[PDB]
Amino acid sequence: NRFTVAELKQLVARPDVVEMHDVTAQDPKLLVHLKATRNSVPVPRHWCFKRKYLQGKRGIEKPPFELPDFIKRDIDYQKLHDAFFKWQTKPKLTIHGDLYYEGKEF
Amino acid sequence: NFDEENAYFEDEEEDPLEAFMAEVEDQAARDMKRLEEKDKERKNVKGIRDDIEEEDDQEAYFRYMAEN
Amino acid sequence: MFLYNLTLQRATGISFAIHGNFSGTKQQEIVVSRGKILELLRPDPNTGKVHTLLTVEVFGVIRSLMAFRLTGGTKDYIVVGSDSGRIVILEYQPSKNMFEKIHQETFGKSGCRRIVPGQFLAVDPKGRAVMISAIEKQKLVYILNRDAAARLTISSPLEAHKANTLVYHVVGVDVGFENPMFACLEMDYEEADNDPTGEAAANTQQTLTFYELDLGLNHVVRKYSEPLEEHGNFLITVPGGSDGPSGVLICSENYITYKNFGDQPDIRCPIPRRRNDLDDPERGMIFVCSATHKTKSMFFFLAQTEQGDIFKITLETDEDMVTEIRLKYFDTVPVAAAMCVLKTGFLFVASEFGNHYLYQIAHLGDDDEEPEFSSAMPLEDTFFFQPRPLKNLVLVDELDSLSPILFCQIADLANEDTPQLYVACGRGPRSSLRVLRHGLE
Amino acid sequence: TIHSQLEHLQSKYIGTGHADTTKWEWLVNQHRDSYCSYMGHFDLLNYFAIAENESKARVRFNLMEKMLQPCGPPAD
Amino acid sequence: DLIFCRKQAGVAIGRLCEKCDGKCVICDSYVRPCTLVRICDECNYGSYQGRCVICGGPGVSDAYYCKECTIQEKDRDGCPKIVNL
Amino acid sequence: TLIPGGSESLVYTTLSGGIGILVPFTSHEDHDFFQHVEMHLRSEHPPLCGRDHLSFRSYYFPVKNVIDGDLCEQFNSMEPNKQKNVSEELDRTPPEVSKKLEDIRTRYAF
Amino acid sequence: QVAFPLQYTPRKFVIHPESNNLIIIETDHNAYTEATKAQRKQQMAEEMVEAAGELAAEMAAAFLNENLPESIFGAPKAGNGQWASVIRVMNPIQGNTLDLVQLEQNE
Amino acid sequence: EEQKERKIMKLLLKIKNGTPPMRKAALRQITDKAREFGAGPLFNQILPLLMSPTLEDQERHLLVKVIDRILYKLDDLVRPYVHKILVVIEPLLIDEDYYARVEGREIISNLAKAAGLATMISTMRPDIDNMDEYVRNTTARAFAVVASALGIPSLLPFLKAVCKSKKSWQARHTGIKIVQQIAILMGCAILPHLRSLVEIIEHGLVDEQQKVRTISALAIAALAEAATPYGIESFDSVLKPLWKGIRQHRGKGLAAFLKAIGYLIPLMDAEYANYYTREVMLILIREFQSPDEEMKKIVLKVVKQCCGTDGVEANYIKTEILPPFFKHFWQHRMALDRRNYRQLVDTTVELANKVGAAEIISRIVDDLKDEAEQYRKMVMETIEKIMGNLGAADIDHKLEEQLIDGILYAFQEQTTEDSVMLNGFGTVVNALGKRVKPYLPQICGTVLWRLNNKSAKVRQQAADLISRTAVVMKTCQEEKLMGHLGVVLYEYLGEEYPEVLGSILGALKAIVNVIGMHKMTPPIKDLLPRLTPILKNRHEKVQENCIDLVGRIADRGAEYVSAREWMRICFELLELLKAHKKAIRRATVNTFGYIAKAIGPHDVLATLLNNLKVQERQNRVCTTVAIAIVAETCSPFTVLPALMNEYRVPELNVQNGVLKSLSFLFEYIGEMGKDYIYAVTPLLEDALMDRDLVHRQTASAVVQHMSLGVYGFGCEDSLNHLLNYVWPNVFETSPHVIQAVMGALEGLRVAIGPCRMLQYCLQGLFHPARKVRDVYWKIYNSIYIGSQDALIAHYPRIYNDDKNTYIRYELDYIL
Ligand SMILES: CC[C@H](O)[C@@H](C)[C@H]1O[C@@H]1C[C@@](C)(O)/C=C/C=C(\C)[C@H]1OC(=O)C[C@H](O)CC[C@@](C)(O)[C@@H](OC(=O)N2CCN(C3CCCCCC3)CC2)/C=C/[C@@H]1C
Ligand SMILES: [Zn+2]
Ligand SMILES: [Zn+2]
Ligand SMILES: [Zn+2]
């Protein structure tokens, strides 16, 4: 008394958002409809994994911290303050729906 | 009941009412007899106290903890 | 990009209106609420002009506005319930021309919420208690007192919550220095959420519930609750004590009912209809607002329908019992959101849209030939009357109001150099196109 | 036990959900607080009363009447 | 058993002891006290009249919410007195 | 542009009959001064019915790059003691603050 | 401000670039058109004249003569899917209506 | 079975010594049980336990709640026992404990509501006529409680009947006492029934019995006190008898009538108030000469009450009232009389508040020089009260000279160190201000003589006087023997008594804080190295004053001592941020800010980072606080690069310290952080990608504090970017990590808005796995409880199915 993947793919307006477990929900039609809303980033993708969200591979061994360019170019007066606020740039930022996951650094 | 004035004042010491009392006594005796008889009481609930008749939030939380 | 906001012309639509002696003297003033602006007006009894004394931006949503006075005082206070989780009490200072905040009591989170009070506000007619209520289960009661310096003191709130309950309207009941009473139109929806057939949704009635505050025991109790015949909108406080009986008027669809707890039967009067009406016969008729005028000799009410017809309601009474409700056609004015009857014989009409009006009540008493309807009259079938031009009222003043603005164009369509504002505003047969120019005329 | 008390107080507030909440309960909750928000905000009611050509008291009464059973009666 | 009271708060002002004087009752911060704490009537009665809301010792000064808790409207819940069962 | 020889503004219209404008700042100094005026008036002159001013202008979305000039012009209606307490933090007298408030209004609107 | 009266709720207007005239559209719900009002009133008259009773005194001729002004007594709000719309050409200097096009009942 | 119900109603022990949950459970069940148990057994057992000789307060309060519940569950069955209950609880109404009285009144109120009025009257009427005066008082108080519970008009007929009783005067006395107790208990709520009560009690003022007249006057006074400032038409039939009585009576009854007059006068208009004052004033002037002291107290109260109204003007007062008042009341006999001493002071101050300060101040200032010191302290108290309430404006040359000479002579002629002379001297000099130029040499000589020796209890009082008067001491343009005083205060820096050292440090600080560091005699490079060892003293006053003094020195005289000593002093102050006292912490924060502003952020920041690396927990937390202080005083631009350079060390427990410092820094600077969010974003990225749990927990804390710090400033880009890294941690089982994640999410709900949060929750609200649903519904409930109203505009569209309608059609309208 539960849909199959191909049967539910025939009912929905957007079949490419249907997945393996989606037919096992209590209300798959509402689930697939919310998966197709014109926003609403998806789930963090590691809920079904078994490695506690930290992958022990990919060679994470790397430099500790690279300071920005503005970091390098009393200790410094209001002229070097002027320098730090003339050199200040906006860094790279990801938009609303770009979640991070273990792999997406390399 | 304390006031240095109250102590000062309370220190120097050395027909219609009857009719009203009689009427009150008759009414009171009738009411007492009716309650003792409990023969004709419909128990018409006057005012229901919602707080007295309804579990509080803390009581509900205790009940929930006991349940699980 | 950084922007600075400026207001050029404030809002002119009225939501609520109260009247009273807010300056402490014998003259009467009106406090009106815009959406987010509070405003004090004073109509001149010599010329009939309405002057604006004070206007303040409150930066919130005003949802309920009441006036009350303590016993022995000569000045009225203002109770405001808003979209914050606070009840506020204000006092007008005539010498400083500003509103002074007297009390602030916080009870919940901000915003127009389902279960946080602030939508309904009732006050005891003697001024010793105030009730703030939400549309859902939560209700709170504050006791108001006075110290030896004649300043107002407020107590901690008493709860009267009741789950799965909806409130239509709350009013305070006028008792003779007895325990304060509050009346509510309530509906329980618990049964309707459990029936999949949809039959518990129907067969569900409004109740008229009475809440008694026992100042000796300091708690609120449900005393009486009775199911009603059909669903009613707002309630009306009947003046009680030593001048009048102590009940409520329930305004409903096609009817108006008087009700009181005790041995008093229910009295119903159907609302009269206009003879040869051109409106759809399936539609009913409700009252939209009311105004009470109490006099040391008698009292009456003024209620207005959706068509804009004001009827004059009087009450035929006995030593304690009410026997008849009599209705008489009074006049026709635009549909109002609030009506205030002022001593010195003035009626203030704040319309839902468009200009507001101040009328002189020219004809006191009723020496006329037009019929007077009654609850004692038998009818199998409804009463009928003929609408006519103004007979009891005279128009004295008209306050301009741009609400609602629907379309605007700023353009130099004349051959001045300054542009004019062409504004399509208004609704129904009272709409208009207005040209606005900056300057004096 | 503070976290458990929070889990009991959050459940107490009307409109909150949990892992067994159905579509019907969610939707009637948002319909009900939508109607209350319409009753609260003065210019939304203005918009509706201009749109459907009714008095504001009539729109308020209609919303209160719709409050009882929004989205129809429940399942099974 | 560290649980807040969470009853309807009244006109009584919350108090803090000499050890808890600068603390916020909800988050235990010391920066920027902003809003005066109110407690219910059963927490302010008889022997409970003046007492620390955090621990229960003799109160010496007013309890406050921090600006961080005031911004999130955490001063809008019930009585914040710590009660043990 | 509303006045002859003035600057362009964004005029809006409301369902309650209100008319208002949003005008851009041209320098950082005016923006900073008006930001500090708004900050100090948010605390020492709070809304009358118990509302938080910053929370009201963030009703559905947080405010971004707008200064409420209807809160700022309430400075001219405070009492002289609080007007002095506010003005002495901006390193200024009340008449100078009043003149600065009137300048931006007369630059765009009436 | 100067005001010029309209018939229904105005929705939107445009400006003619050459003549500087205004083209306004007005529309209302629960509303009759002029023709529907006239024929509904004639219907009610002919039905009240045949009320089967002495047919000897005519309130119908008095009911048809004077129309109570809608700006004072309101427009008859009748129907749930009933509309009424109008297109108007107006001079903005004066208030005169240059042209008026009435549309059918439920448009 | 009988003890059946007893053994089961040991529920009251279930409650007495029981847990709160079972407390309320047994409460509810015994409430349901009451009607069937019966009032007989229930009361037979509870009234002994309430009569227990050593019951507690909370226990007694719980017993009251239980009685109220039984009264609710049994209304008309309590009648045959009412009498009994009363004999147990008619006491507790004259008890010296306030809460005992409240509990007794609540019990009697619930009993009167349970039973009827007729029953209460029938059980209470036999003790109306009793001869034992102890019973007639509890009876009147209980009748007042019953009137407050069931209403006044319900008892008005019984009252009207009982005080017309021709049978005995005791019944009339008790009825009038009932009216008086009703007034006392109900206050301003008697106003609608004022005239009824007044006409009920008014005929007693002319009785043949003297006890009835006295109690009637006391009841009139009580009603007038409850009514103020309203009600004078209701007191009209009493004006003639009261004044005729004060004209004919003499003694106790005269005192009662005068109390009534005094409570009635402030209710009148100017005419009546002015006319009535004259009459009662000639009578009161006659009564000034009375030996009785109760009479003196009543006369003083009436004088204060009448002289405070508008109908009485200063001319009549100074012409008729002041000579006899000052001739009869101002003698040291009044000073040793402790009972009326405060009354005399208050009456004199409130007289001066209307007639003018000059006359009062003169008439008593000639008396500042006196053989008795009690009479000296009295005059000083009155003078300084008047000076603080009105000032020294109309005080002139002769009066100024007399005041100064008197206060100087009173200061020297002092046996025990008292606060009276100290406060008098202080307020007199502070009110005179820049006017006392030569009495400044005089006062300096006096304080020099007092501070030179004599046991340091005179020296600490002199130091307090210096601390409170140095402002006016220097603002008069005089600095030299100011330095002479500072030299001596410096020499008095080694003291075994910490209380005197606190006052010495306070005086030194008040000096150096008010005189300029310029041109001042005692050198700073001498005071400060002598001052730094006192910072380790363990007395609170010494510590606070020393820290305040070092702070002032660092704020103004920073260029007089080397930076190395400043560094040592700040490193020593580091340990005072842990003080159990709030004033110590406040002063330490201030002084650290000053020292940091003085010596520069670079060296102190390097030292603070080194100290953060190597120490135990509490010292590292204090170092974090110190770093935040340095970054706030000297703009965070000067601290952030050096702190971010320390995160570059490839070693745990160093990066975690940097993260804790950043957390507290953003929490402490709040709004100032809007210019520094772009600089710390990559570091927070790195810390959120880390495997270490403390890294991610602290990064979440930083995100929360940063979010709540910038709100309304347009920093949503970086906060959304950081949310993209915070969100994957919602599936974390560790409690501390998930707590920090929830805090960060609720901060982003405010800074970023609820729409974004709902967009993050939508796809998980209905996930097939129960874990995802639990987590997402917790987050959603947190988003819903705050800002329920905004969510109305954010919900996504959901289409109708065959059974139900889900579209919100009103929002689709288009005008
Ligand atoms: C994470 C750090 C720890 O929680 C730590 C604070 C705490 O765990 C320790 C235990 C204990 C008892 O030693 C804590 C010490 C307390 C402190 C260092 C705080 O100092 C005080 O309490 C002093 C007093 O209560 C009030 C001083 C005051 C107002 O400066 C307070 O901080 C503030 O309110 N701020 C922060 C905001 N800051 C700006 C500056 C511009 C204008 C003022 C308001 C905005 C002003 C000063 C105290 C700060 C220390 C954290
Ligand atoms: Zn907090
Ligand atoms: Zn504590
Ligand atoms: Zn509590």
Q: How far away, in angstroms, is E6 Cα from ligand 4 center?
A: 6
Judge whether B57 is closer than 8 Å to chain D, CB to CB: yes
Sequence letter at residue H285: I
- Beta carbons of C216 and H787 less than 8 Å apart: no
Q: Beta-carbon neighbour count of residue H478 at 10 Å?
A: 14
Q: What are phi and psi of H332, to 5 degrees?
A: -65, -20
Sequence letter at residue H40: G
Give the number of the ligand closest to the Cα of residue E44: 4
Q: How many residues are given for chain C?
A: 441
| Total domain count, chain H | 1
Dist. CA C12–CA C404, nearest whole Å: 9
Chain B residues whose beta carbon lies within 8 Å of the beta carbon of residue E7: 57-58
CB-ligand 1 contact for H490 (6 Å cutoff): no
Judge whether D56 is closer than 8 Å to chain B, CB to CB: no
CB C268 within 8 A of CB C256: yes
Q: Enumerate residues 6+ apart whose C-beta is below 8 A from C441.
A: none
If phi > 0 it is left, if psi is from -120 to 50 it is alpha, else beta; for residue H368 that is alpha
H or E stretch covering H334:
helix H332-336
Q: Nearest residue CA, atom 41 of ligand 1?
A: H669
What's the CA dihedral at F40, F43, F49, F50 to 10 degrees?
150
Sequence letter at residue F7: S
Q: Nearest residue CA, atom 27 of ligand 1?
A: H586
CB-based burial label for H638 (10 Å; 0-12, 13-18, 19+) = buried
**H635 by DSSP, 3-state: which?**
coil
Judge whether C307 is closer than 8 Å to chain G, CB to CB: yes
Judge whether F101 is closer than 8 Å to chain C, CB to CB: no
Q: How far away, in angstroms, is H24 Cα from ligand 3 center?
A: 27
Q: How far is CA F5 from the centre of its chain?
A: 23
Dist. CA E79–CA F8, nearest whole Å: 53
Q: Enumerate residues 6+ apart whose C-beta is below 8 A from G39.
A: none
CB-ligand 1 contact for H693 (6 Å cutoff): no
If phi > 0 it is left, if psi is from -120 to 50 it is alpha, else beta; for residue C302 that is beta
Which tokens sit at H767? 């996930």
Sequence letter at residue H52: S
Interface of C with B (CB under 8 A): 159-162, 212, 219-223
The residue among D45, G100, D51 whose CA lies nearest residue C428 is D51
CB-ligand 1 contact for H421 (6 Å cutoff): no
Resolution of the PDB structure in angstroms = 2.7
**C428 by DSSP, 3-state: which?**
helix
Physical contact, D and F (3 or more Cβ pairs within 8 A) = yes
Query: What 8-state DSSP symbol labels residue H126?
Result: G
Q: Enumerate residues 6+ apart whose C-beta is below 8 A from C209.
A: C183, C184, C186, C222, C224, C225
Which tokens sit at C110? 């901000």
Q: Is residue H84 part of a domain?
A: yes
Q: What are phi and psi of G13, to 5 degrees?
A: -140, 155
CB H520 within 8 A of CB H483: yes
Give the number of the ligand closest to the Cα of residue F43: 1
Domain that holds residue H719: 1-796
Q: Beta-carbon neighbour count of residue H480 at 10 Å?
A: 10
Which of E3, E7, E79, E85 is most worth mutating to test chain D (most D CB atoms within 10 A of its CB)?
A: E3
Q: Enumerate residues 6+ apart whose C-beta is below 8 A from D20.
A: none
Q: Enumerate residues 6+ apart whose C-beta is below 8 A from A90.
A: H678
- Beta carbons of H294 and B31 less than 8 Å apart: no
The residue among F106, F29, F109, F36 whose CA lies nearest residue F75 is F36
Judge whether D13 is closer than 8 Å to chain F, CB to CB: no
CB-ligand 1 contact for E31 (6 Å cutoff): yes
Dist. CA H811–CA C61, nearest whole Å: 20
Which tokens sit at G11? 């929705």
Which tokens sit at B68? 């699980």
CA atoms within 13 A on the CB side of C297: 1
Could you state, in order of their start, the residue ranges of all structural domains in chain D?
1-76
CB C183 within 8 A of CB C208: yes
- Does E5 appear as a known binding residue? yes
CB-ligand 1 contact for H578 (6 Å cutoff): yes
H or E stretch covering G45:
helix G34-49
Q: What are phi and psi of H757, to 5 degrees?
A: -65, -45
H or E stretch covering H66:
helix H57-72
The residue among H675, H633, H684 whose CA lies nearest residue A85 is H675
CB C232 within 8 A of CB C271: no
H or E stretch covering B20:
helix B16-37
Whole-number Cα distances in Å, A1 to A5, A23, A24, H39, H770: 13, 11, 11, 62, 20
CB-based burial label for H683 (10 Å; 0-12, 13-18, 19+) = buried
Chain E nearest CA to B31, separation (Å) = 38
Q: Enumerate residues 6+ apart whose C-beta is below 8 A from A31.
A: A22, A25, H766, H767, H768
Strand order in the sheet with C16-20: C16-20, C29-33, C37-43, C50-57
Residue H229, preceding bond cis, omega within 30 degrees? yes
Atom of ligand 1 nearest to the CA of H586: 23
Neighbours of chain H (3+ CB pairs under 8 A): A, B, C, D, E, F
Q: Enumerate residues 6+ apart whose C-beta is below 8 A from C349.
A: C333, C334, C336, C339, C356, C357, C358, C359
The three-state DSSP-derived secondary structure of H448-472 is HHHHHCCCCHHHHHHHHHHHHHHHH
CB H763 within 8 A of CB A42: yes
Q: What are phi and psi of C9, to 5 degrees?
A: -145, 120
**What's the N-to-C CA distance of chain H in angstroms?**
79
CB H798 within 8 A of CB A33: yes
The residue among H493, H474, H472 whose CA lies nearest residue H482 is H474
Dist. CA H158–CA H122, nearest whole Å: 11
The residue among C100, C82, C110 whose CA lies nearest residue C23 is C100
**H728 by DSSP, 3-state: which?**
helix
- For chains E and H, CB pairs below 8 A equal 36
Give the number of the ligand closest to the Cα of residue E48: 4
Query: Count H helices, E strands: chain H?
Result: 43, 0
Query: What 8-state DSSP symbol labels residue F6?
Result: -
Dist. CA H164–CA H175, nearest whole Å: 9
CATH number of C3-399: 2.130.10.10
Q: Is residue H512 part of a domain?
A: yes
From C110, C140, C159, residue closest to E73, measured CB to CB = C110
Neighbours of ion ligand 3 (CB under 5 A): E 17, 19-20, 52, 54-55, 57
Q: Is residue H588 part of a domain?
A: yes
Which of H544, H576, H578, H589 for mutating ligand 1's site (highest number of atoms within 8 Å of CB)?
A: H589
Chain C nearest CA to G27, separation (Å) = 9
Dist. CA C416–CA A15, nearest whole Å: 63
Dist. CA H576–CA H585, nearest whole Å: 7
Dist. CA G33–CA G50, nearest whole Å: 26
Q: Enumerate residues 6+ apart whose C-beta is below 8 A from H695.
A: H655, H656, H659, H687, H688
- Helix H20-37 to helix H57-72 angle (10° resolution) is 40
